[PDB]
């Protein structure tokens, strides 16, 4: 209403449905480079499924929005910045979308878990304001996404599987350093359709994988100084008990000038992959985690692939 929409903030879309519209409430970013983030609360306490978003984004301003499902969002205020934090507790991403980069539209039949027992009960909504035109002082901005719920169960649920390297420095000015994470995979399969990267400005190449009696097929891989939307795997890979998930982030040491720790808790750098996956429905859970290097052997039979740039 701070942009003068009349949408309110749930709209019923027929018997078993309803759409959320998370909006800014009209804020100025006064600096190029700037991060808002709002929450939005379920109107409703028992589960439901994501099944569709809309994004609503501004013509030039907005360069990248993402989705978080919680139960904590970082403030209660109308909004904030998001370098004060996005959750307090663990903050699930659900979606992201970067202006030129490809979408990645559900597949038919899989939603997100929210809500009920188990799931996320607000969902938090951060938006990326690239540089900005003087004389925009005054100017209010409601961008943001519309999200399709609905409280009929899928048949396939989506979920999120994090890999993130906490164990490896970078010294300063070694031309490649890599980061290297695995964990065995012990639950019903996953079919991992999308990915996303996430490092700082050292990140050259990250990519994921899942092998099995010793083979590799690629998962992912991509420059994390590209845009940070989820990119589509073309043919999604089934993961199952008995496979290895492996990642590498390939970083950089030059031009630094102490060592650079890589998932430290006052960062830095990070390696973050997000492997975004579905189960069937009664089998699955909403998310799972790798935080460790438990087959760092493997590492010297890598593809070749996985060491080769993607530039710029």
């Known amino acids: 209403n701070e942009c003068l929409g009349t949408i309110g903030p749930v709209t019923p879309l027929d018997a078993s449905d309803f759409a959320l519209d998370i909006?800014?409430?009209?804020?100025?970013?006064?600096?190029?480079?700037?991060?808002?983030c709002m929450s939005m609360r379920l109107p409703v306490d028992e589960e439901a499924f994501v099944i569709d978003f809309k994004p609503r984004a501004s013509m030039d301003t907005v360069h990248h929005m993402l989705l978080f499902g919680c139960n904590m969002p970082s403030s209660t205020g109308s909004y904030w910045f998001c370098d004060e934090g996005t959750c307090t507790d663990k903050a699930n991403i659900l979606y992201a979308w970067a202006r030129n980069a490809?979408?990645?539209?559900?597949?038919?039949?899989?939603?997100?878990?929210?809500?009920?027992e188990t799931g996320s009960k607000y969902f938090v909504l951060?938006?990326?304001?690239?540089d900005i035109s003087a004389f925009r002082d005054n100017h209010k901005d409601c961008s943001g996404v519309s999200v399709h719920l609905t409280r009929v169960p899928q048949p396939l649920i989506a979920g999120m599987y994090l890999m993130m390297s906490v164990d490896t420095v970078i010294p300063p000015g070694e031309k490649v350093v890599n980061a290297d994470i695995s964990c065995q995979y012990k639950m019903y399969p996953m079919h991992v359709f999308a990915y996303r990267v996430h490092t700082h400005h050292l990140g050259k190449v990250v990519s994921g994988?899942?092998?099995?009696?010793?083979?590799?097929?690629?998962?992912?891989?991509?420059?994390?100084?590209?845009?940070?939307?989820?990119?589509?795997?073309?043919?999604?890979?089934?993961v199952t008990f008995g496979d290895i998930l492996a990642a590498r982030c390939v970083f950089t040491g030059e031009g630094r000038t102490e060592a650079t720790h890589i998932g430290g808790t006052s960062?830095?750098?990070?390696?973050?992959?997000?492997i975004m996956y579905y189960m069937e429905a009664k089998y699955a859970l909403s998310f799972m985690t790798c935080t460790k290097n438990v087959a760092p052997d493997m590492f010297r039979t890598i593809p070749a692939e996985a060491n080769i740039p993607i530039p710029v």
């Open 126 to 130: 951060q938006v990326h304001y690239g």
């Open 23 to 36: 909006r800014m409430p009209g804020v100025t970013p006064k600096e190029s480079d700037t991060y808002f």
């Open 209 to 238: 994988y899942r092998v099995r009696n010793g083979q590799w097929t690629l998962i992912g891989r991509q420059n994390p100084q590209l845009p940070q939307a989820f990119y589509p795997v073309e043919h999604p890979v089934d």
């Open 267 to 274: 960062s830095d750098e990070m390696c973050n992959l997000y």
């Open 102 to 116: 490809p979408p990645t539209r559900l597949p038919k039949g899989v939603g997100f878990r929210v809500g009920g």
